[PDB]
Structures are given as structure tokens and as C-alpha cells.
Design a binder for this molecule. Structure first.
Ligand SMILES: [Mg+2]
Ligand SMILES: [Mg+2]
Ligand SMILES: [Mg+2]
Ligand SMILES: [Mg+2]
Ligand SMILES: [Mg+2]
Lengths: 117, 100, 51, 55, 88
RNA sequence: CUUGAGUCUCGUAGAGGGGGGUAGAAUUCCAGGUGUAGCGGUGAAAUGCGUAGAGAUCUGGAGGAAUACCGGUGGCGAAGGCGGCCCCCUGGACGAAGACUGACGCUCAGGUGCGAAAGCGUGGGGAGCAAACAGGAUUAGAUACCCUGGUAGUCCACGCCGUAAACGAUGUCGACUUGGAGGUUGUGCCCUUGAGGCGUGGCUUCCGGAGCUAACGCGUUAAGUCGACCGCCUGGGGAGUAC
């Protein structure tokens, strides 16, 4: 297709779901995969295993781009926050950098109340 | 008069102005019975973050001792001079010299 | 929280995030806020920190 | 620790995340800890130091 | 507070002599200074209540000073008011 | 007269107050790129947003609000309360040597002023959050808690409202009465060789003796021992209600 051989790997470790997107060092998403979309829903979709099957499932798409090495961009808590990385590398990927782009405001917007039981 | 440790950094592709700016300010201050106690031209320099774009800035020092008026008249020029970007001006604390 | 670590070696060195951002702060701002709850519930940690 | 231009002395009171290092994990006196913080704050605005390690 | 210059200056213009900062008259003077100078600052802002507290204190304090002077020497009191145009 | 109170000189610390600038992190919104079938949410769900291409991802821009870290057993203020950085205007407190006034003091019904949040008026502003309201879910029901949205308001200027578990549930000023450990800020002195050691003022935590207390507990920052002035209580309900 383009044969990038080296891009980045964004990981959305949301408290409920986990999606992994692979894109060149530019930003242009090459391919993506999501936990909830990889089968199990609700309860099971928000587990560490969930993200794993997703990560590998993503590579089965971007690997066709001749991707060899790639960095790792992670943000957010919840499971699959770290898991995704392992499966990503173990799946045969020359990893290099890993940074937590988790958004942390120096006190700005007021978070929502919610949860009260 | 009240001392003011001013440190203004100008746009990189404007470095040629740095000399002009300085010579003017200094004179303007002295003209009003000012009294410069320091001066440093750190010139170009890497930037921690791309403030107002670019990753390089031309820094300059001052640390004068003139009446609030003139220095205040200057606090505005730095704003109406596309060339100069971020600016700051601390207070007296007794004229400092050398080092930095 | 950067982690490049030259030379190949399957070690995450994740401990870094666990010493600043990530949870603690993230989990903190997750749900609602406090407004007054900290000056107390949080300032009550000393009543314990004493010993 | 008292001056802001001294980006060298301040880099000691800053974790590899931009945030300033607590006073309890440096012994540094309270009186000094406050003065030191200010130097780091105004220094960050002069782009002489990073707000965080990300940007 | 007040400028050292104006301070020392007004110290003699009313002080029983020189470097005798403390005379009932001296005080009143030093008080009326900031008392009148502050108005200029208070005319503006207005919502600076916390700073008003100080203003009011010196105000009342002055009254308590004059009231005293008049009790210990009706002379200086009547003469002091003039140089300051106080008492209405 | 000088020890009470105040004045002057020189410093010290401070999220004290008023005004004006300004920086970075994030959210949301708009536009475009990459990319494709989900995303969002929960205990599950569902409403909802997605092929009219969301979500994720990158770039550019707009805008409002709040200032991670430092930060604390912390600091400042009369109380309410006050946290990014910079400038201007300004109030208080403390120490130090001393110099000066010479009881100018303490308290204070009435009075005057300050007063969290919510609320009200005028004109602005409006990102996020959210009374009301509308859906979805839960339940026997669910006019709720939970989820998806969302107006007032929250922000600003000026004016009004004067209340709160406005609390230390403990009025202000002053003098006395064994201790211990700690925080914070000033200061005299000593090879500080180095931090340090001998102290000496201000503010402030925790423990505790005597004594006080119905007990719990308070305990040199007293609720102990005393003095000056003030406010207030006199069974529960009715009722901080009616007139
Ligand atoms: Mg709601
Ligand atoms: Mg209000
Ligand atoms: Mg209104
Ligand atoms: Mg206090
Ligand atoms: Mg006790």
C-alpha cells in the first residue's frame, strides 16, 4: 500500500473500552481496532484481556502496511492500559518509545458529579 | 528611582533588531535621568516550549533604575512591536550587577 | 513521562507514570470534585499521619 | 532556588515530569521552598524551563 | 505607608523641635497625611474594603488624639486644627 | 513619671485587599486530513451519537472558566474568606537597636460598616458543571438515587438581599499557674571550619499535670486562678410561629 515500516500506536484505555489505533508519525491513521468491537461486550469488554485481543487484531490490519518498528502513545487508566502494549510488541513489533499522553489539566474545567450510591 | 529587572526576548528572524531595540531603550531610560546597572544579550537560544510558535528566541536583559513612568511607557512598546514576543519585568530588590 | 530507553529489551519501565501522573491524579479528577471535602477529609490524613 | 535565570540550580528541584519536587523529599527549608517555587514558576513563563515534560 | 521624605518633613513642621516624632501634634499631622492622600486612592477602586479598615482606624485614632490634646491643652488643639483645616 | 497605648527609623514574612495585564495544561465547539464500524454508557442496559462516516488520530482556529506540581501538622485577614506569573494603588502584623509623646487606655446599648452560598434588578458573557425540564433504566410504585441531554445559575460590572452547623457550637482587653514533642516567622551570641550549639520575641499544631467539669473532656492559645465592660439563658410542644 505505502509501506511505512514505522509509525505510532495510540491507545485509548478508557475506563469502559479500549481502542488501539496505528498511524504514521504524521497522524494519518493507517488502521485501528477496538476491544468492545472485538467480541465480548459490557462487563468483559472492559477487562485487560479485552484490549489484548484488540491490539493484535489491529496489527492484522496495519501490518499489511509493511510496518516494522513503531512508538507507543498511551493515555487513560483502566485495564488494557499496559496490556495492549505487550500484545502489540509480542505480535512482532520493533518497539521504541512509550509515553503517557494522558490529559492532566492544571485545574481547569469542573469534572461532572455523577456516581452517588 | 525604582529598579526593574526586565528581560525581553525577540523573534529569531528579527535578531538584527536586537541591537537597535537595546540602544533605544537604554537611551530613552537615561534620557529621563535613568540609570542602567546591567545589560546582557543572550542572543538566540533554544526554547523549553514553542511559545507563540518557533522553538528559538533572542533573549535580552536589562535591570535599570528609572522612574516608573518611562519603564511603564516601555511596558507598552513591547506590546506594539511584532518583533518582540514574550516579555517580563520584575522589581528592584536593590540593583543587581554581573553574573546571570 | 517519556520512555525511549535505547538498546532492545522487553522491559516497560512503566514505574515512571506510577510516580507522577496516571492514577492518583487521574482517578482523583475522574468523578465529581470536592470544594470543601479536601480541607477536611484530606486534612484528616494528618490526624492519622501523626502516627 | 532564589533566581529564575539559574535554570541549572532549578533543574535539581524538578522531577522528570516538569512539576517541582516536594520540600519533604529535599529537606529544603520552608522559607526557601517557597522562594524556590517562584523562581521555577516565572522561569517556566520565560520558556527557560518546561511546564511539563510533554510540552 | 508614607514617604520617608514627607514623613520627616512634616515631623519638623509640627514637631516640638527636631527628631521628636511622637508629639500629639506631630501624630495628628502624620495621620491627616495618609488620611487625605488615601481618599485619592479610595475615590478609585472603592471596593477595596479591607484597605478601608486601615483608613478608618487612623481616622478614629486621629479623633482620639485631638480629643486628648484639647483635654490636656486647649491651646495646641485650637491651633493644630488650623494648620490642617480639620474640624469641619 | 514611664511600665499601658501610640509615634519615628530599619528590616522580615505573607493565597490580606482594589485595579490591569499575561502564560501553560485541559475541556468543548468550528474547519480540513488519515481512517472504518462502531463509539458512549451500566450492575446490566437502554436513551443517545455513528455509513449524511462517528469514535480514535493529526492540523488550524474560536472561546470561557479554573490555575496540577509547589502545598503543608502551612501562611495572611476582624469575620466572611483569600492560591499560576507580572506591574500599579493599598491595609495589617512581627522583630530589632534604639529615639519620641506621656495614661492619649479597656469595654460599648443605640449607631455605622463589612457579610459564604443561594436569590433579585440592569446590561454583558456562557467552555465545563448543573436546580427546572425531557427522555432511558430501576422498582410493586420511583414525581429519586443511576444513565443520555439540559435552562436558570455558576463568570463580569454596578446595585439589592443580609442569612449559614457564619462553628472553636467557646465575646473583647489584661495579669497570673508544673511540663513534653513539633510547625512557622524575626533576632542577639558562639572556631557555624559544616550544617551547627547557647539562647530570645510573634503566630500556630499535638499530648498532658494541677485545677476545673455531670461526664465527654479543657488544660499557659484553659473550659484553671482573677479583674473591666458587653451580649444572652430561665421546662418540652405550639413557635422563631401569629399580630
Ligand atoms: Mg443529571
Ligand atoms: Mg452570589
Ligand atoms: Mg443575575
Ligand atoms: Mg492568625
Ligand atoms: Mg490536652
Amino acid at each position: 500500500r505505502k509501506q511505512v515500516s514505522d509509525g505510532v500506536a495510540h491507545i485509548h484505555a478508557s475506563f469502559n473500552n479500549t481502542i488501539v489505533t496505528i498511524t504514521d508519525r504524521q497522524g494519518n491513521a493507517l488502521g485501528w481496532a477496538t476491544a468492545g468491537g472485538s467480541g465480548f461486550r459490557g462487563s468483559r469488554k472492559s477487562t485487560p484481556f479485552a484490549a489484548q485481543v484488540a491490539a493484535e487484531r489491529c496489527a492484522d490490519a496495519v501490518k499489511e502496511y509493511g510496518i516494522k518498528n513503531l512508538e507507543v502513545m498511551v493515555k487513560g487508566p483502566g485495564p488494557g492500559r499496559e496490556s495492549t502494549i505487550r500484545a502489540l510488541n509480542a505480535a512482532g513489533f520493533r518497539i521504541t518509545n512509550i509515553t503517557d499522553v494522558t490529559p492532566i489539566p492544571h485545574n481547569g474545567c469542573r469534572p461532572p458529579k455523577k456516581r452517588r450510591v | 528611582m525604582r529598579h526593574y529587572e526586565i528581560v525581553f526576548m525577540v523573534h529569531p528572524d528579527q535578531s538584527e533588531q536586537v541591537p537597535g531595540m537595546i540602544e533605544r531603550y537604554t537611551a530613552a531610560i537615561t534620557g529621563a535621568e535613568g540609570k542602567i546597572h546591567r545589560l546582557e544579550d543572550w542572543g538566540r537560544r533554544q526554547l523549553a516550549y514553542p511559545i507563540n510558535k518557533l522553538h528559538k528566541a533572542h533573549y535580552v536583559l536589562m535591570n535599570v533604575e528609572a522612574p516608573q513612568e518611562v519603564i511603564d511607557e516601555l511596558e507598552t512598546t513591547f506590546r506594539f512591536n511584532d518583533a518582540v514576543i514574550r516579555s517580563m519585568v520584575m522589581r528592584t530588590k536593590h540593583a543587581v550587577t554581573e553574573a546571570s | 513521562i517519556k520512555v525511549r530507553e535505547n538498546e532492545p529489551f522487553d522491559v516497560a519501565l512503566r514505574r515512571f507514570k506510577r510516580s507522577c501522573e496516571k492514577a492518583g491524579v487521574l482517578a482523583e479528577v475522574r468523578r465529581r470534585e470536592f470544594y470543601e471535602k479536601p480541607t477536611t477529609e484530606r486534612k484528616r490524613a494528618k490526624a492519622s499521619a501523626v502516627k | 532556588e532564589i533566581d529564575y535565570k539559574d535554570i541549572a540550580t532549578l533543574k535539581n528541584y524538578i522531577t522528570e515530569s516538569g512539576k517541582i519536587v516536594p520540600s519533604r523529599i529535599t529537606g529544603t527549608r520552608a522559607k526557601y521552598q517557597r522562594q524556590l517555587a517562584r523562581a521555577i514558576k516565572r522561569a517556566r513563563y520565560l520558556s527557560l524551563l518546561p511546564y511539563t515534560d510533554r510540552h | 505607608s508614607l514617604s520617608t521624605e514627607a514623613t520627616a518633613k512634616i515631623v519638623s513642621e509640627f514637631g516640638r523641635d527636631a527628631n521628636d516624632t511622637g508629639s500629639t501634634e506631630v501624630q495628628v499631622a502624620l495621620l491627616t497625611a495618609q488620611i487625605n492622600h488615601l481618599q485619592g486612592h479610595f475615590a478609585e477602586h472603592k471596593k477595596d474594603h479591607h484597605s478601608r479598615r486601615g483608613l478608618l482606624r487612623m481616622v478614629s485614632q486621629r479623633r482620639k488624639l485631638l480629643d486628648y490634646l484639647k483635654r490636656k491643652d486647649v491651646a495646641r488643639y485650637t491651633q493644630l486644627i488650623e494648620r490642617l483645616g480639620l474640624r469641619r
